[PDB]
Amino acid sequence: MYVRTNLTILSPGWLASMTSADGTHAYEMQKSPVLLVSWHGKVMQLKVEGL
Amino acid sequence: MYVRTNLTILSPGWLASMTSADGTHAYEMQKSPVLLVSWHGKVMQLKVEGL
Amino acid sequence: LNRFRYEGAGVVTGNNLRTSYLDLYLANEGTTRLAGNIGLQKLEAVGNGVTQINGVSSRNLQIVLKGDPKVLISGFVNLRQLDMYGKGTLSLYWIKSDTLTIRAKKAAKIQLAGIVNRLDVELWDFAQFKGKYLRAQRSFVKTHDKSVAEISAVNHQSSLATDASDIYYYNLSKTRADFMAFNGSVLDMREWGQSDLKDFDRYNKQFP
Amino acid sequence: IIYYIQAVIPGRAWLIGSNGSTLTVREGSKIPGYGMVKLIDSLQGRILTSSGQVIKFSQ
Amino acid sequence: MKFKKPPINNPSDDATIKLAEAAVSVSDSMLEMAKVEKVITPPSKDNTLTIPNAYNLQARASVDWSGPIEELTARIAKAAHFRFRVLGKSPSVPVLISISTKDESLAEILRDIDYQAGKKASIHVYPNSQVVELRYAKIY
Amino acid sequence: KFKKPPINNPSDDATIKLAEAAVSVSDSMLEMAKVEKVITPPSKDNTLTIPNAYNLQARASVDWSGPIEELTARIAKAAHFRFRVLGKSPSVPVLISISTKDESLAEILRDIDYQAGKKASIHVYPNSQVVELRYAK
Amino acid sequence: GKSPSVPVLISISTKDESLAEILRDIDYQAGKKASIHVYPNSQVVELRYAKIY
Amino acid sequence: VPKLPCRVDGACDATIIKMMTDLNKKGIKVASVGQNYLISIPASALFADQSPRLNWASYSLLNEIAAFLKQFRKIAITVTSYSSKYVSVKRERALTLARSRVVSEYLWSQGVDSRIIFTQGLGSDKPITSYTLGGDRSPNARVEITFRRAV
Amino acid sequence: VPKLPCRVDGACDATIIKMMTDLNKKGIKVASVGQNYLISIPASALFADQSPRLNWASYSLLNEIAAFLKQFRKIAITVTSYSSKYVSVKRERALTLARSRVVSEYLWSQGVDSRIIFTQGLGSDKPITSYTLGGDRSPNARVEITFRRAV
Amino acid sequence: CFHPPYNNFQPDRRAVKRVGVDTGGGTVGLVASIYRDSKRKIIRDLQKQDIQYVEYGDTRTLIIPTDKYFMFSSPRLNEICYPGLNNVIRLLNFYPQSTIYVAGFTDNVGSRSHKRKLSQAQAETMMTFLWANGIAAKRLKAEGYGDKNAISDNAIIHGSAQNRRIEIQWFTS
Amino acid sequence: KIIDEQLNKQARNLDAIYDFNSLVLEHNILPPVLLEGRNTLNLADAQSIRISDRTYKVAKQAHFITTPPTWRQYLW
């Protein structure tokens, strides 16, 4: 799984991460159905299908 | 048969025993449908199903 | 050397007196300066006088006044009780006592300083009492309408105000308890700039 | 030997040592173990001596 | 005449009961390890010399935050009307702080933030210049 | 007239036990952290002071990564200060990275010395209008 | 001492005697693996396991 | 979309407008400009005379405005209080600080969602009216709640 | 599960409630706190004047006592006997000890599923009433039965 | 006419409102008042609340559940139990000579020093509340104990809810 | 479904008690796993009894992470 956001990722444990000048985050990680994200001091869940 | 409790076992004679820091016991013994334990100086029987 | 009474515009100034106990009665402008190491228990002032006593070495005292004298006393004693029903003003240097019971009714301005284990304060009206520079383990305060109280309890603080009255706790004790009935006010009134001021804890937190 | 405050008037302070020895101190005097008292702050529980020590209350 | 006993709660849940019966033992183990680490550790100083309080720092807050550090301390500084300062290079792995408190003052909020930072991050303050200065630690 | 209780009140004994257990373990972890953390005294904490020269109060935006040498030199040129370096540049150059939009050159140099740490130091002389870099052997 | 991993088991079913005789019967049925002492002025009841193995 | 909510949790903008209208006819200042929001309440409907004792009937109105603040989505809220000049500066500052602390604590006890509640008080530092002849009846004695709307 | 027991043998909390109400109507005091229960009986209903001996009618009362006492899984029963100040310390201590021994032996004779009986007497060292006019009619002269309910 | 926050610590009037709403028969109103303020009626109201009353010998004790009558982990008393607290003061008006002991206990879990501190704070809060209702301080003594004598087992959940409590004892002479 | 609702009903206190993040070592290292044991007795056969007082065993060796774990992947 390759993912781009500007948030903080929590759940699976990623393998590689990159950050832009503007704080945009990119991660290479394993396949997973769901994600855990700290957004603004709040805990959130993300749903990903199509695996 | 692997059993975990905090009581005391009497009848069959276990092959091995371990005690926790708090005093919980774990016993290694043979297969038996019944057991005989002691609670507070009072004897009791015990039933094991699904052998 | 045990009896002292003066009335009618009397000015006495003296020092270097040693005694165990003497009883003082004063009236009508007794300008009394006494700067000896004087131990005593019973003093009475009728009203309209000024008295400075510098040096008190005694271990019991019980004074109650009726008019408006003005007294400044240096030394220490185990004060037991105090009642005021007039125009009382009082200032005292040091007290290392056990239990105190203070009652003020009509008009009072009291400044006290020392170490008390346990004290009870009843203020009715027009009473400004200071517990600044005076520390207690058990504090009990009952304040009625138009009363002003300062409390510096160390261990345990207990206070109720009825209405239109001000209570200021100059130190956070280990235990706090306050109540307001109609318009009573209980407030910290601290500098907010002390470099080593402690904060609240789990136990000390009360929300008015 | 250490000391702690009991009650502070403007001008004089009450001290108790580690041995229970009492003291009443003016603005300017001499105290062994601390030197010369340089300022009596009665607004807060701090007094500064010549040696550079500040007396607080024990807890 | 009808007999009662005081604590009348709502009907409970077995799952909550089992979680509690794990939690008591966890708390006991954490307590005893804390006391033995306390007695084997000779403490030296507290963080008051590193960060004191000041006037206008007496404003208080209550928080429940479970994320990174930077946005939280930025909100703290903007409440403080203090100028921000950041020192050190940002780590790849984010420093994650979670505080769920109840009505504490700004100074001790920042003080226990600096305590829960650990070795990764540190906080200094300067009231004479009204400067809040965070510093990452140069490891590796 | 009316007032509700708090909505997530522990109105069950298990919930009560959970909440107090959480309180206890968080307090114990706070105690462990407080006895764990090593701090520095503010008397002799080694960091760059503020030299507060009048030309040192300018503001800029700088993004840069790499060796400290020409960065410090061009900063000194922007500050009209003479620049000198005592010590040896090793085989590996000391590399930092600054990405800032608006802060002054004084705290820029302060962070430069902070990321330098043990390897090198920056000293400012406003009497003889110079800035120098000291290596450590 | 410390309790061995094999437990000590005691069966007592008596009726209405003093605690001194109760404890004497207890240590008698304990035998050679444990013993009972009482310090009366110290008001302490103590058992000791066998220092064996 | 069966598994995705079309709106935020139990909300109705018609109810938002209606409760804003009811508060404005009640006498509570409602301010909406940009995407930031401000609410001002006079203290004479809140406390006693120069005193942080809470009126029992005011708990209903506090519950209602707490429900309104629960109806929005936000991150951080500043709550402050101002008053007249009575004895000192510190007395007024401490009174406003205590009042803000109490109302913030009750608000957190209520089910509003937020991460940050900021408490401070000033008393009579920042006036709002040249006319200051009233006491606690004067409208410059007030409580303000300010926030910025999330997203 | 029909093979397994459903409740304890001979157990009905309604019957427990009924006999408890009857006993408190009789005047024998039944106290319940936590899991430790107390039963207080005045000595005048059981023994004669200064007597280590019972009338025949007491056996029905003790029989119903044992009937209630079957209804709990417990371990230890403690029975204290207290008397009135009559002659000495020796007579009161001996009489209280004898009364406790007699009621303990009859209790063990009844089939209460117990593990241990602890009996003691104190005479008149700790009363519970300052009004000490009566002799064996005194209320503090009594027998107290304490136990802890176990699971 | 009444105020739920302790009526500004004033000696409450109920009989005048009773006789007013019953005259709006006065004799039936006053016999209903003496039936409604009687001591057994007071104990029945305390039984309707979750308060335990024990009267044995010359001593009398009251048992209060802290979880029912307090905010969690706080010295702050809950205010919704004001009918119970007013009935407590109404019953306590009947013993104007006896000294009062008040003590508090908790469960086992936590620091021993911390739970002792919390019990001390709870007991001092309760004794301050009753001191504010016009009782002399010479008749009082407060104590926050730990868990050194529990009326219930701590390891069972319902017993752990039971054992944390506030006890109030009084003598008679 | 019921137990998932009741589990997530008290989400914050679970993170309060299971602070993995404070337990993470200083170099982004998960600390290893240790198991204790007391009063070991073994009866292998006749004429053979082996006892020990205490013992300790490593379960999982220490390794890296990017994020500390939570209760969800163990408990949801």
Author numbering:
A (entry chain JH), B (entry chain IH): 311 to 361
C (entry chain IM): 113 to 320
D (entry chain If): 208 to 266
E (entry chain ID): 23 to 162
F (entry chain Id): 24 to 160
G (entry chain HD): 110 to 162
H (entry chain IK), I (entry chain HK): 38 to 188
J (entry chain IL): 42 to 65, 88 to 236
Give me lines lifted from the publication on this model.
Using 3D variability analysis, we reconstructed a total of five maps that displayed differences in the way the outer membrane cap (OMC) and periplasmic ring (PR) were positioned. These maps led to the identification of an approximate 16-fold symmetry about the center of the dome positioned within the OMC. Within this dome there are 16 α-helices that appear nearly identical at this resolution. Indeed, a model of the C-terminal domain of DotG generated in Swiss Model using VirB10 as a template fits into the resolved dome density. However, we have unexpectedly uncovered that the Dot/Icm incorporates only 16 copies of DotG into the OMC dome out of the 18 DotG copies in the PR, giving rise to another symmetry mismatch within this system. Based on the structure of DotG modeled within the PR (residues 791–824) and the homology model fit into the dome density (consisting approximately of residues 857–1046), we hypothesize that DotG extends from the PR to the dome, though a physical connection between the two structures is not observed. (A) Two DotC were observed in the maps that were reconstructed during 3D variability analysis, one which contains an N-terminal extension (DotCLong) and one which does not (DotCshort). In contrast, the N-terminal extension of DotC was modeled as two relatively large helices positioned near DotG and bridging adjacent asymmetric units. Notably, this portion of DotC was only observed in either four or five of the 13 copies of DotC observed in each map. The movie shows that the OMC dome, OMC disk, and PR of Dot/Icm T4SS can accommodate various orientations in relation to each other that suggest that the complex could undergo a ratcheting motion, in which the dome and PR rotate back and forth about the central axis with the different regions of the complex tethered together by the physical connections across the symmetry mismatches.
